Design a protein around this ligand. Sequence first.
Ligand SMILES: O=C(O)CNC(=O)C(=O)O
Ligand SMILES: [Mg+2]
Ligand code: NI
Ligand SMILES: [Zn+2]
Length: 331
Amino acid sequence: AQNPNCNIMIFHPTKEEFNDFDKYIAYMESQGAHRAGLAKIIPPKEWKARETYDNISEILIATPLQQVASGRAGVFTQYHKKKKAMTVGEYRHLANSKKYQTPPHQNFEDLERKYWKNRIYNSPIYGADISGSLFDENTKQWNLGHLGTIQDLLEKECGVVIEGVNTPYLYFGMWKTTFAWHTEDMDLYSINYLHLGEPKTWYVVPPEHGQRLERLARELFPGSSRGCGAFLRHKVALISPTVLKENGIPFNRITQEAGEFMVTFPYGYHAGFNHGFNCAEAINFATPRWIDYGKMASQCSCGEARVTFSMDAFVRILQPERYDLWKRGQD
Ligand SMILES: O=C(O)CNC(=O)C(=O)O
Ligand SMILES: [Mg+2]
Ligand code: NI
Ligand SMILES: [Zn+2]
């Protein structure tokens, strides 16, 4: 069995290997990359996402989110308070202000220590989940707005044609902005490209051990667990590496820098934080190997998780028994 310790693998494809996206994902899996739940892909030196980032300041962040924490430093939830719209140029200036800027630090490990010590005492503002793309239309390789759609994959594998669309999302971050522990909708893959700025640190639980994280989460968030049998779908709970280690939960960590791709694999729980002002682009995707994970994915039916239009068909076709209850949650 390849990668039996479920380590995060790092790949350096050549320009020739960067042509065929599906083939390269399948290669990485042949080497056991999925066992970690997360992989890093460093593009060939010939490649670029676009020519420059000099003209992005007028992008609008219609609903910036202030991430307010509750709990203790290693075990907390966050809620998202909506803020007034601002442009990317306004948000960059805000991120660099004395109130929000990254503190002085020695290295990524020192910064990580400072994040876990102090995150809860601040409320950073995240420009998350903005439909759009920063890939140039002429970028032919690993262009996250030109991937095969999940609807077409389902149709290719299973023969059923369904409604829905699959487009990318932009994330503008600042110091301490946080992504809570989650798997993707319908336990899909994700791919995330860090276009510019400061790094993003990731934590990940191997897919084969995801239920260990779920059991800890039920223990640590006991009211939330009574509320919903899949409350990590709400994307609000944080658990630190120290707490994970104390509870024997297998995980790994890695820091993504600008110009790098990360892939999350089906049922790979992940969480993390931004080091300072940055911009990432991410989208979900599927492969043939996903189908069995989609059929088994948990679902939130309490009403909190509320998701895209396109998840309807995935539930309807892959999980017809759950469909009725899940849809009640959506309505
Ligand atoms: O970058 C973020 O805030 C969150 N991203 C992801 O969870 C991802 O790409 O799957
Ligand atoms: Mg602009
Ligand atoms: Ni994710
Ligand atoms: Zn729920």
